[PDB]
């Protein structure tokens, strides 16, 4: 890692040209070059390069994969003064909390929404159940009802969760990673519905992101599911669209995993003060967030001043409606073994290589297999096994401590 400059990694579906502008504004003042890159599979190649002291100074991803980075000692703990912490929403600070330590700067809150073409669909559907009847009607016009990304489980999980599928059992502000809910009734129900759109030719089994994006933005399909980042390409196309709550399924609402975009500082960086000065005083400002958001939209930003300006956007409001009905994503290291397990099950059940009951069984057992962890109470003079984490601080706590010792509550920590 070069001393005296900054190298930033951020996923290619964000506004990295905007961050580049914030880099050139940092460079004008300080003379410090700021190089912004968007590598493919950067969420996976960062713990590779960081393990030997390589990689970027700053890493950008949704918060869920940061606990694994921190567990492997790849992220510097970040130390904003209470004055700066007050500038960002408390909701977003909890998402970047791990083992009680802040390990990333929260940037923005993402949530999947149902996006619809107002000209084809005056009143978008409130339920999943009526989409097949809707597509059948639109098929008489040579158009489709719904196309979205079936290759990444993020996009399909809201429906899988609607009737009661979950990743880890959440209780009084605690996760239990031995209570995995991938092959329960609610998830089997939700997944069986999705594939029954493909069987009845309402969706194609191999729709990826680019295909669904091109098809909605070209006016071929009336609906798609996506996050705020996608609005930039919908806006520059000539589609007249709106953003609304994901439709219910079996009367229960669709529950997307809520993502907090976060900026982590490499533990092996010689530029931790420059990275902190860049993020705190250039990115997390009205001017800085406005340059990134104006490239590809960020969603509801973590900074109270700028969010107070974006809150009047109906698309932000819709994202917040879906964010409320969903749940914040865990950040514990097991989350990525879970994302792999669920990715394989969905693509196999949608393609027909497996049945839904076959695919969810394999994923449930595959997942739980990776999931040895010890309670974080120091008064245990011997490592005490547990599978419970506290949600707020992402801290392990043994079953004994969870019941008798009222240190960690859902309301307050
Ligand atoms: O598909 C599983 C995937 O979900 C999330 O990735 C999202 C991300 O949150 C969004 O910012 C956007 O880039 O779309 C991604 C889906 O491809 C998790 O962040 C990710 O770790 C997980 O693998
Ligand atoms: Zn304990
Ligand atoms: Zn706690």
Curated annotation (Swiss-Prot):
Gene3D superfamilies: Periplasmic binding protein-like II. One of its GO terms (cellular component) is ATP-binding cassette (ABC) transporter complex. It is found in: Periplasm. It holds the Pfam family SBP_bac_1. Induction: Induced by maltose and the transcriptional regulator MalT. Permanently repressed by cold shock in a PNPase-dependent fashion. One of its GO terms (biological process) is maltodextrin transmembrane transport. Keywords: Periplasm, Signal, Sugar transport, Transport. The keyword Lipoprotein does not apply. One of its GO terms (molecular function) is carbohydrate transmembrane transporter activity. It comes from the Bacteria. Part of the ABC transporter complex MalEFGK involved in maltose/maltodextrin import. Binds maltose and higher maltodextrins such as maltotriose. Belongs to the bacterial solute-binding protein 1 family. PANTHER family: MALTOSE-BINDING PERIPLASMIC PROTEIN, MALTOSE_MALTODEXTRIN-BINDING PERIPLASMIC PROTEIN. The complex is composed of two ATP-binding proteins (MalK), two transmembrane proteins (MalG and MalF) and a solute-binding protein (MalE). This is Maltose/maltodextrin-binding periplasmic protein. It comes from Escherichia coli (strain K12). The gene is malE.
């Amino acid at each position: 890692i070069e001393e005296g400059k900054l190298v930033i990694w951020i996923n290619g579906d964000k506004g990295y040209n905007g961050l580049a502008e914030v880099g050139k504004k940092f460079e004008k003042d300080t003379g410090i070059k700021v190089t912004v890159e968007h590598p493919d599979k950067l969420e996976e190649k960062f713990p590779q390069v960081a393990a030997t002291g390589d990689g970027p100074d700053i890493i950008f991803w949704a918060h869920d994969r940061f606990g694994g980075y921190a567990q492997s000692g790849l992220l510097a703990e970040i130390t904003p003064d209470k004055a700066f912490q007050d500038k960002l929403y408390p909701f977003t600070w909890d998402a970047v909390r791990y083992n009680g330590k802040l390990i990333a700067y929260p940037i923005a809150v993402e949530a999947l929404s149902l996006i619809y073409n107002k000209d084809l669909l005056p009143n978008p559907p409130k339920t999943w159940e009526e989409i097949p009847a809707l597509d059948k009607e639109l098929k008489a016009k040579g158009k489709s009802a719904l196309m979205f990304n079936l290759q990444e489980p993020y996009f399909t999980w809201p429906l899988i969760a609607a009737d009661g599928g979950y990743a880890f059992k959440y209780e009084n502000g605690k996760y239990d990673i031995k209570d995995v809910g991938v092959d329960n009734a609610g998830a089997k129900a939700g997944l069986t519905f999705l594939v029954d759109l493909i069987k009845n030719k309402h969706m194609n089994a191999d729709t990826d992101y680019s295909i669904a994006e091109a098809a909605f933005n070209k006016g071929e399909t009336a609906m798609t599911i996506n996050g705020p980042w996608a609005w930039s390409n919908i806006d520059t196309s000539k589609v007249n669209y709106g953003v609304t709550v994901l439709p219910t399924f079996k009367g229960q609402p669709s529950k997307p995993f809520v993502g907090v975009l976060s900026a982590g500082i490499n533990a092996a960086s010689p530029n931790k003060e420059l990275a902190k000065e860049f993020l705190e005083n250039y990115l997390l400002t009205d001017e800085g967030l406005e340059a990134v958001n104006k490239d590809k939209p960020l969603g509801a930003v973590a900074l109270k001043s700028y969010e107070e300006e974006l809150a009047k956007d109906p698309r932000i409001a819709a994202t917040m409606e879906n964010a409320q009905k969903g749940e914040i994503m865990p950040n514990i290291p097991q989350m990525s073994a879970f994302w792999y397990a669920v990715r394989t099950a969905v693509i196999n059940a949608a393609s027909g290589r497996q049945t839904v009951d076959e695919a969810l069984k394999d994923a449930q057992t595959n997942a739980a297999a990776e999931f040895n962890i010890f309670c974080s109470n120091p008064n245990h003079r011997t490592p005490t096994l547990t599978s419970i984490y506290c949600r707020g601080c992402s801290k392990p706590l043994c079953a004994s401590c969870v019941l008798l010792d009222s240190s960690h509550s859902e309301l307050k920590c």
